[PDB]
Coordinates of C-alpha atoms and ligand atoms in Angstrom, one line a residue:
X1 CA -0.2 -0.2 -0.1
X2 CA 0.9 3.6 0.2
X3 CA 4.9 5.2 1.8
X4 CA 5.8 7.9 3.7
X5 CA 9.1 9.3 2.3
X6 CA 10.8 11.8 4.6
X7 CA 13.9 14.0 3.7
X8 CA 15.8 13.8 7.4
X9 CA 17.6 16.6 8.7
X10 CA 16.4 20.4 8.7
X11 CA 13.0 19.6 9.4
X12 CA 12.3 22.1 11.4
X13 CA 8.3 22.5 12.2
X14 CA 7.1 26.4 12.8
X15 CA 3.2 27.2 11.8
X16 CA -0.5 26.0 13.3
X17 CA -2.0 23.3 13.1
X18 CA -5.9 21.8 13.6
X19 CA -6.8 18.1 15.5
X20 CA -9.2 15.5 15.3
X21 CA -12.0 14.8 17.2
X22 CA -10.5 11.7 19.4
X23 CA -10.3 8.3 18.2
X24 CA -10.4 7.1 21.0
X25 CA -13.6 8.9 22.4
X26 CA -15.3 8.9 19.5
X27 CA -14.8 4.6 19.7
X28 CA -17.1 4.1 22.9
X29 CA -19.9 7.7 22.1
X30 CA -20.3 5.7 19.2
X31 CA -21.1 2.4 21.2
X32 CA -23.4 4.9 23.7
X33 CA -25.3 5.8 20.5
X34 CA -27.4 2.4 20.9
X35 CA -28.8 3.3 24.3
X36 CA -31.3 6.6 22.8
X37 CA -34.8 4.4 22.1
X38 CA -35.9 7.9 21.3
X39 CA -34.6 10.7 18.8
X40 CA -31.2 10.4 16.8
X41 CA -27.8 11.0 17.9
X42 CA -25.4 13.8 16.1
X43 CA -21.8 13.3 16.6
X44 CA -19.7 16.3 15.6
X45 CA -15.7 16.7 14.9
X46 CA -15.3 12.9 13.9
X47 CA -12.1 11.8 12.0
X48 CA -11.8 10.3 8.9
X49 CA -10.2 7.3 10.2
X50 CA -10.4 2.7 10.0
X51 CA -11.6 2.7 13.1
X52 CA -14.4 5.1 12.8
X53 CA -15.3 3.2 9.8
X54 CA -15.1 -0.1 11.8
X55 CA -17.4 0.8 14.9
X56 CA -20.3 2.2 12.6
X57 CA -20.3 -0.8 10.8
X58 CA -20.6 -2.6 14.1
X59 CA -23.8 -0.6 15.6
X60 CA -24.9 -0.5 11.8
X61 CA -25.2 -4.4 11.8
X62 CA -26.7 -4.1 15.5
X63 CA -29.9 -2.5 13.3
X64 CA -28.6 1.4 14.9
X65 CA -28.6 3.3 11.5
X66 CA -25.6 5.3 10.9
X67 CA -24.8 8.5 8.4
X68 CA -21.7 9.4 8.5
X69 CA -21.2 13.0 6.9
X70 CA -17.3 12.2 6.2
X71 CA -16.7 16.2 4.8
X72 CA -18.7 17.7 7.4
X73 CA -17.3 15.4 10.3
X74 CA -20.6 14.4 11.6
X75 CA -22.3 11.1 12.2
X76 CA -25.5 10.3 12.7
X77 CA -26.7 8.0 14.5
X78 CA -31.1 6.5 14.6
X79 CA -31.6 2.9 16.6
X80 CA -35.1 3.4 17.6
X81 CA -35.2 0.3 15.7
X82 CA -35.1 -2.6 17.7
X83 CA -32.1 -3.1 18.1
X84 CA -30.0 -6.8 17.9
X85 CA -27.5 -8.2 19.4
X86 CA -24.5 -9.1 17.5
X87 CA -21.0 -7.8 17.3
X88 CA -19.6 -10.2 14.5
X89 CA -15.8 -11.9 14.2
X90 CA -15.1 -10.2 11.1
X91 CA -15.1 -6.6 13.3
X92 CA -14.3 -7.9 16.5
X93 CA -10.6 -9.8 14.8
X94 CA -10.0 -6.6 13.4
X95 CA -10.4 -4.2 16.1
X96 CA -10.4 -5.4 19.6
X97 CA -12.4 -1.8 21.2
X98 CA -15.0 -3.5 19.1
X99 CA -16.4 -4.8 22.1
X100 CA -17.0 -1.6 24.4
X101 CA -20.8 -2.0 22.5
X102 CA -21.6 -5.3 24.5
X103 CA -22.6 -3.3 27.5
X104 CA -24.8 -1.0 25.7
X105 CA -26.4 -4.0 23.9
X106 CA -26.9 -5.7 27.1
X107 CA -28.5 -2.1 28.4
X108 CA -30.8 -1.9 25.2
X109 CA -31.5 -5.2 24.6
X110 CA -30.8 -7.2 28.0
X111 CA -29.0 -10.0 25.3
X112 CA -25.7 -10.1 23.1
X113 CA -23.1 -11.5 21.1
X114 CA -20.0 -10.6 20.9
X115 CA -16.5 -12.5 19.6
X116 CA -14.5 -13.3 21.8
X117 CA -10.9 -10.6 21.2
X118 CA -8.0 -13.0 20.1
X119 CA -4.4 -12.0 20.3
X120 CA -2.8 -8.3 20.0
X121 CA 0.9 -7.4 19.2
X122 CA 0.9 -4.5 22.2
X123 CA 0.1 -6.8 24.9
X124 CA -2.2 -9.6 26.6
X125 CA -5.1 -7.8 26.9
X126 CA -7.4 -9.7 28.3
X127 CA -11.2 -8.7 29.2
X128 CA -11.6 -10.5 32.4
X129 CA -12.9 -6.6 34.6
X130 CA -15.5 -6.3 32.1
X131 CA -17.2 -9.8 32.3
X132 CA -16.5 -9.7 35.8
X133 CA -18.3 -6.2 36.5
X134 CA -21.1 -7.3 33.8
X135 CA -21.9 -10.8 36.3
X136 CA -21.6 -8.4 39.4
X137 CA -24.6 -6.7 37.5
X138 CA -26.2 -9.7 36.5
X139 CA -25.2 -10.5 33.5
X140 CA -25.1 -14.3 32.6
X141 CA -21.9 -15.4 30.7
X142 CA -21.1 -17.6 28.8
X143 CA -17.8 -18.5 25.6
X144 CA -19.4 -21.0 23.0
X145 CA -17.5 -21.0 19.7
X146 CA -15.6 -17.7 20.0
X147 CA -18.7 -15.8 20.7
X148 CA -18.6 -13.8 24.9
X149 CA -22.8 -14.8 24.8
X150 CA -24.0 -12.4 27.3
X151 CA -27.8 -12.7 29.1
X152 CA -28.9 -10.4 31.9
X153 CA -32.8 -11.5 32.5
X154 CA -33.2 -8.2 34.8
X155 CA -29.6 -5.8 34.3
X156 CA -29.2 -4.2 37.8
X157 CA -26.7 -1.9 40.0
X158 CA -23.4 -3.7 42.0
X159 CA -21.0 -1.9 43.9
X160 CA -17.9 -3.0 41.5
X161 CA -14.1 -2.8 42.4
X162 CA -11.4 -2.3 39.8
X163 CA -8.5 -5.0 39.7
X164 CA -7.0 -2.0 37.5
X165 CA -8.8 1.3 36.2
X166 CA -9.4 -0.4 32.4
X167 CA -10.9 2.5 29.8
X168 CA -12.3 -0.5 28.0
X169 CA -14.1 -1.8 31.2
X170 CA -14.9 1.5 32.6
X171 CA -16.7 2.5 29.4
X172 CA -18.6 -0.9 28.9
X173 CA -20.1 -1.0 32.8
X174 CA -20.8 2.8 32.6
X175 CA -22.7 2.4 29.6
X176 CA -24.1 -0.8 30.9
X177 CA -25.3 1.6 33.8
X178 CA -27.2 4.2 32.4
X179 CA -30.2 1.8 31.3
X180 CA -29.9 -1.3 34.7
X181 CA -32.5 -1.4 37.8
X182 CA -30.7 0.4 40.1
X183 CA -27.1 2.4 41.4
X184 CA -23.9 0.5 40.2
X185 CA -20.7 2.1 41.9
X186 CA -17.6 2.1 40.0
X187 CA -14.5 1.9 42.0
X188 CA -11.0 2.4 41.0
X189 CA -12.6 3.3 37.6
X190 CA -10.7 4.7 34.9
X191 CA -10.0 8.4 34.9
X192 CA -9.2 9.5 30.9
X193 CA -10.4 12.6 29.6
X194 CA -12.4 9.6 27.5
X195 CA -14.4 8.7 29.9
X196 CA -15.3 12.3 30.7
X197 CA -16.2 13.1 27.3
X198 CA -18.4 10.0 27.6
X199 CA -20.5 10.8 30.2
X200 CA -21.0 14.3 29.2
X201 CA -22.8 12.5 26.2
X202 CA -25.1 9.8 28.5
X203 CA -25.7 13.0 30.5
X204 CA -27.0 14.9 27.6
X205 CA -28.9 11.5 27.1
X206 CA -30.9 11.7 30.4
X207 CA -28.6 10.1 32.2
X208 CA -26.9 10.3 35.6
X209 CA -23.8 9.8 35.2
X210 CA -21.9 11.3 38.5
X211 CA -18.1 10.8 39.5
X212 CA -16.8 10.7 35.6
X213 CA -12.6 11.9 36.0
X214 CA -12.3 10.1 39.9
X215 CA -11.8 7.1 41.0
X216 CA -15.6 6.7 41.8
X217 CA -18.1 6.7 38.8
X218 CA -21.8 5.9 40.6
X219 CA -24.7 5.6 37.5
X220 CA -28.5 5.5 38.7
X221 CA -30.0 4.4 35.3
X222 CA -33.2 5.6 33.8
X223 CA -36.1 3.4 32.1
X224 CA -34.9 5.2 28.4
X225 CA -32.3 7.3 26.8
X226 CA -32.2 10.1 24.1
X227 CA -30.7 11.4 21.1
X228 CA -28.5 14.8 21.2
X229 CA -25.6 16.3 19.8
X230 CA -22.4 15.8 20.3
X231 CA -19.2 17.9 20.0
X232 CA -16.4 15.0 20.3
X233 CA -13.7 16.0 22.6
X234 CA -10.3 17.5 20.9
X235 CA -7.9 14.0 20.1
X236 CA -5.3 14.7 23.1
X237 CA -3.0 12.3 21.4
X238 CA -2.3 13.9 18.0
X239 CA -2.5 16.8 20.2
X240 CA 0.8 15.7 22.4
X241 CA 2.1 13.8 18.9
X242 CA 2.7 17.6 17.7
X243 CA 3.8 19.0 21.2
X244 CA 6.4 16.1 20.4
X245 CA 7.2 16.5 16.8
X246 CA 8.0 20.6 17.6
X247 CA 10.3 19.3 20.4
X248 CA 12.3 17.1 18.2
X249 CA 12.8 19.4 15.8
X250 CA 13.7 22.8 17.0
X251 CA 10.4 24.0 16.4
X252 CA 8.1 26.7 17.3
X253 CA 4.2 25.9 16.9
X254 CA 0.4 25.9 17.9
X255 CA -1.7 23.2 18.4
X256 CA -5.3 25.1 18.0
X257 CA -7.4 24.7 20.9
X258 CA -5.3 22.0 22.6
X259 CA -6.8 21.0 26.8
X260 CA -3.9 21.7 29.1
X261 CA -5.2 19.8 31.1
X262 CA -5.8 16.7 29.1
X263 CA -1.5 16.2 28.6
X264 CA -0.8 17.7 31.7
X265 CA 1.8 15.0 32.2
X266 CA 3.6 15.3 29.0
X267 CA 4.1 18.4 29.3
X268 CA 5.5 18.1 32.7
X269 CA 7.8 16.7 31.4
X270 CA 8.7 18.4 28.3
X271 CA 9.0 21.0 30.4
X272 CA 11.0 19.8 32.5
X273 CA 13.4 17.9 29.0
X274 CA 13.7 22.2 28.4
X275 CA 11.3 23.0 26.0
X276 CA 9.1 25.4 26.0
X277 CA 4.8 24.7 26.7
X278 CA 2.8 28.2 26.8
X279 CA -1.1 28.5 27.0
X280 CA -2.2 31.6 24.6
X281 CA -6.1 32.3 23.9
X282 CA -6.1 30.3 20.6
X283 CA -4.1 26.5 21.9
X284 CA -1.1 26.0 23.3
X285 CA 2.5 27.1 22.1
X286 CA 4.9 24.5 21.6
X287 CA 8.9 25.7 21.6
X288 CA 12.1 24.1 21.4
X289 CA 15.9 25.0 21.3
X290 CA 17.6 21.7 20.5
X291 CA 20.7 22.0 22.4
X292 CA 18.7 22.5 25.7
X293 CA 17.1 19.2 25.9
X294 CA 18.2 17.0 28.4
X295 CA 17.4 13.4 28.8
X296 CA 14.4 12.6 31.2
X297 CA 12.5 9.3 33.1
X298 CA 8.8 8.4 32.0
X299 CA 6.3 5.5 33.5
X300 CA 3.5 5.2 31.6
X301 CA 0.4 5.2 34.2
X302 CA -3.5 5.5 33.8
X303 CA -4.3 9.0 33.4
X304 CA -3.3 11.1 35.2
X305 CA -0.6 9.6 34.7
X306 CA 1.9 10.0 31.9
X307 CA 0.5 8.2 29.0
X308 CA 0.8 5.3 26.8
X309 CA -0.2 6.4 23.7
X310 CA 2.1 9.1 24.2
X311 CA 5.2 6.7 24.8
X312 CA 6.5 5.6 21.3
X313 CA 6.3 9.5 20.0
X314 CA 7.9 10.8 23.5
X315 CA 11.1 8.4 22.0
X316 CA 11.8 9.6 19.5
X317 CA 12.2 12.8 21.4
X318 CA 14.2 11.3 23.8
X319 CA 16.6 10.0 20.6
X320 CA 17.3 14.2 20.2
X321 CA 17.8 15.0 24.3
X322 CA 21.3 14.7 25.8
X323 CA 21.9 12.0 28.1
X324 CA 20.4 8.8 29.2
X325 CA 16.2 8.5 29.0
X326 CA 15.1 5.9 30.5
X327 CA 11.2 5.4 29.5
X328 CA 8.9 2.6 31.6
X329 CA 5.8 1.3 30.3
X330 CA 3.5 -0.5 32.6
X331 CA 0.1 -0.4 30.9
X332 CA 1.0 -2.9 28.0
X333 CA 3.9 -5.4 28.1
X334 CA 4.7 -5.7 24.5
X335 CA 4.8 -2.0 23.5
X336 CA 8.6 -1.7 22.4
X337 CA 8.1 -3.1 19.0
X338 CA 8.9 0.7 16.9
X339 CA 12.1 0.5 18.5
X340 CA 13.2 -2.6 16.9
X341 CA 12.1 -0.4 13.5
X342 CA 14.5 2.3 14.8
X343 CA 17.2 0.0 14.8
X344 CA 17.6 -0.2 10.9
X345 CA 18.1 3.7 11.4
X346 CA 21.2 2.9 13.4
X347 CA 19.3 3.7 17.0
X348 CA 21.2 1.6 20.1
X349 CA 18.9 1.2 23.1
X350 CA 18.5 -1.2 25.7
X351 CA 15.6 -3.5 26.9
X352 CA 15.2 -4.8 30.5
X353 CA 11.4 -6.0 29.9
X354 CA 9.3 -3.0 30.9
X355 CA 12.3 -0.3 30.8
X356 CA 13.6 1.7 27.7
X357 CA 17.0 3.1 28.0
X358 CA 18.1 5.8 25.0
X359 CA 21.6 7.8 25.0
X360 CA 20.4 10.8 23.2
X361 CA 22.7 12.5 20.1
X362 CA 23.3 9.2 18.5
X363 CA 23.5 10.3 14.8
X364 CA 20.4 8.3 12.9
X365 CA 20.3 7.5 9.3
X366 CA 17.0 7.3 6.6
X367 CA 15.8 3.7 6.3
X368 CA 13.0 1.7 5.6
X369 CA 11.1 0.7 8.4
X370 CA 7.5 -1.1 8.9
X371 CA 4.7 0.3 11.1
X372 CA 4.0 -2.2 13.8
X373 CA 0.6 -0.4 14.8
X374 CA -0.9 2.7 15.5
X375 CA 1.8 5.0 17.6
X376 CA 4.8 2.9 16.6
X377 CA 3.9 4.4 12.7
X378 CA 3.8 8.2 14.3
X379 CA 7.4 7.6 16.2
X380 CA 8.8 6.3 13.2
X381 CA 7.3 9.7 10.8
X382 CA 8.6 11.7 13.5
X383 CA 12.5 9.7 14.4
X384 CA 12.2 9.7 10.4
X385 CA 12.3 14.2 10.4
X386 CA 15.3 14.5 12.5
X387 CA 17.3 11.2 10.4
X388 CA 20.0 12.2 8.2
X389 CA 18.6 10.7 5.0
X390 CA 15.5 9.9 3.6
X391 CA 13.3 7.7 5.7
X392 CA 10.1 5.3 4.2
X393 CA 7.4 4.7 6.8
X394 CA 5.3 1.2 5.4
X395 CA 2.2 -0.6 7.0
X396 CA 0.4 2.9 6.7
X397 CA -3.0 0.1 7.7
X398 CA -2.2 0.5 11.1
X399 CA -1.1 4.7 10.6
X400 CA -5.0 5.1 8.8
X401 CA -6.5 3.9 12.6
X402 CA -5.6 7.0 13.9
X403 CA -4.1 9.8 12.1
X404 CA -6.0 11.7 9.1
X405 CA -3.4 13.6 6.7
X406 CA -0.4 13.5 9.6
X407 CA 1.9 13.9 6.7
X408 CA -0.3 16.8 5.1
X409 CA 0.2 19.1 8.4
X410 CA 3.5 17.9 8.9
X411 CA 4.3 19.6 5.6
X412 CA 2.1 22.5 5.6
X413 CA 4.8 23.3 9.5
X414 CA 7.6 22.6 7.1
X415 CA 8.8 19.2 7.0
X416 CA 9.8 17.2 3.5
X417 CA 7.3 14.8 4.0
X418 CA 5.3 13.2 1.4
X419 CA 2.7 10.0 0.9
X420 CA 3.3 8.6 -2.1
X421 CA 1.3 5.4 -3.8
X422 CA 3.9 2.4 -3.8
Ligands
LIG501 C1 -4.0 1.1 21.5 C2 -5.2 2.5 21.4 O1 -5.6 2.8 22.8 C3 -5.8 2.1 23.9 C4 -5.2 2.9 25.6 O2 -3.5 2.6 25.0 C5 -6.0 2.0 26.1 C6 -4.7 2.7 27.4 O3 -4.9 4.3 27.7 O4 -7.2 2.6 26.9 C7 -8.1 2.3 25.9 O5 -7.6 0.4 25.1 P1 -8.2 -0.2 26.5 O6 -9.4 0.3 26.5 O7 -8.2 -2.1 25.8 O8 -7.0 -0.5 27.8 P2 -6.7 -0.4 28.9 O9 -8.4 -1.6 29.4 O10 -7.0 0.7 29.8 O11 -5.6 -1.6 29.2 C8 -4.6 -1.3 30.2 C9 -4.4 -2.3 30.3 O12 -5.2 -3.0 31.4 C10 -5.3 -4.4 31.1 N1 -6.4 -5.1 31.5 C11 -7.4 -4.6 31.2 C12 -9.0 -5.0 31.0 C13 -8.9 -6.7 32.0 O13 -9.8 -6.6 31.5 N2 -7.8 -6.5 32.1 C14 -7.3 -5.7 31.4 O14 -6.0 -7.1 32.7 C15 -5.3 -4.5 30.2 O15 -3.8 -5.9 29.5 C16 -3.7 -3.4 29.6 O16 -3.0 -4.0 29.6 C17 -7.5 2.5 24.1 N3 -8.0 2.2 23.3 C18 -9.6 2.8 22.9 C19 -10.0 2.2 21.9 O17 -10.2 3.4 23.7 C20 -5.9 1.6 19.5 O18 -6.4 3.1 19.9 O19 -6.0 1.0 19.6
LIG502 C1 -3.6 -4.8 18.4 C2 -3.4 -3.5 18.3 O1 -5.2 -5.5 18.4 P1 -6.5 -4.8 17.8 O2 -5.8 -4.1 16.2 O3 -7.1 -2.8 18.0 O4 -7.5 -5.5 17.7 C3 -3.0 -6.0 17.4 O5 -4.2 -6.7 16.2 O6 -1.9 -7.1 17.2
LIG503 MG1 -5.7 -5.6 14.7

């Protein structure tokens, strides 16, 4: 398929950039549209990404009518018909995030048939927390011929203690709870900004979701939900990716309408490294003097800690700072695959299980590399900007899941980058 070609060196990024709506907010927000038995749900600021198309097919497969106006970045959903129960293998096998329809299907229909996710390269990714939480709400779970078969005679409230603050599990449980009979309390809940945005939509739909953004979410079930119009929160990871890009290239970039609160730990690490990050009326400005960049230690953690979704991109920045940086990835077990590819560009890194050491200032060269996953793809492209020579980034299927027009936005900021058909 396509390749991204980058002429490395002298790619100082200067200018302004517009950021898309959050891919990881839109996926669960689309799942939530299934809950509205009256009216229509309209999502605004929807990015054009392959994961969105898949989620639209999943929701559509449940007899909800989904109309995606790409140019207007609008998704309109009519879920007033009789909603069906199945999230098939053909979708779940291409995007394990599809299982966030499990909760809302159970809330609306009382039974669900959702394909069990298999293997994913970035880590083990079990869903025990989803199922255990659902069982506490009165859901009877079986596994039949590859499908999670779930039935709720009387979906009800429960006091759920999460072993880990799973984003996906918190979303499924929140959504299931909106139409349950009783009060659901999710302790040690995911606190991510996408959780907050989901709660905002649900409440505007007539739900009673409280404490989103805190360690405890309380949902009081109601009989039905209605349609509403919701502006999808800005993609903090795309925003953070451009902040990192500006930093690595000694740039001066304004990330339009960026939310400071959604990138606190990234910004704190950029500041500690020696980058300037300034809040202005029109957005967040990142300015960098390359010679002042100093190595840092980073440990990924559940929000409000440093996001795993900024890890790969941040390791690219670590290649340019002075000294030995350390990246500790605690969220996923196998999310340093991009460093294997970066070895092809001359980058030496020392990986001891969850810890990667990267000495800054190594002389990197352009090379043909292959994306291993969404954020890794971005990290390779960013590295191509600062390496000497031409970098060719392939397996863009991964990139297209979460970045829209990445090459175009970078080119508009001054980078020598193109997307060519191979
Ligand atoms: C990589 C992606 O984004 C990811 C993002 O990295 C992570 C963490 O912030 O949260 C979402 O995944 P997710 O919902 O599977 O993440 P979580 O459930 O929080 O998983 C975090 C960790 O908890 C563990 N976990 C999760 C659920 C569970 O039942 N048991 C369990 O042990 C997982 O193995 C994982 O190692 C994003 N995906 C979406 C669609 O929201 C992507 O864009 O495809
Ligand atoms: C991982 C990335 O899971 P997903 O594609 O999101 O279902 C994989 O398939 O390697
Ligand atoms: Mg996959």
